[PDB]
């Protein structure tokens, strides 16, 4: 689960070579399907991901 009410069963343990790598040289470790957003409208999960990426990059902790 995330902290926003998005529960979910693990369907697949996907290899790291088959995982979509970014331009930074980074794979994800969890893939999320974007169709869990429209009917549920957890926009705070998008803000949490942007905020957690900023918190990791700058070395901060956001409110």
């Amino acid at each position: 689960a995330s902290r926003h009410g998005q529960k979910g069963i693990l369907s697949r343990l996907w290899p790291a070579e088959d995982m979509p790598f970014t331009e930074s040289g980074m794979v994800p470790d969890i893939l999320f399907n974007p169709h869990g957003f429209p009917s549920r409208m957890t926009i705070g999960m998008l803000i949490e991901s942007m905020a957690g990426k900023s918190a990791a990059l700058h070395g901060l902790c956001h409110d």
Partner: protein
């Protein structure tokens, strides 16, 4: 000491303490609003792309 019945009274005095209102009626003193989150100064691009 015959204790006769006297007449009906004219009215009623009623003594009670009054509150002081020199303090209240002043301009209100609310709790100050917390500031909105401001971007920290000194944020730089730390990550440079490889190669």
């Amino acid at each position: 000491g015959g204790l006769t019945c006297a007449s009906a009274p004219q009215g009623t005095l009623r003594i009670l303490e009054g509150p002081q209102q020199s303090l209240s009626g002043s301009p209100l003193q609310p709790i100050p609003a917390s500031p909105p989150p401001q971007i920290p100064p000194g944020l730089r691009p730390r990550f440079c792309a490889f190669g």
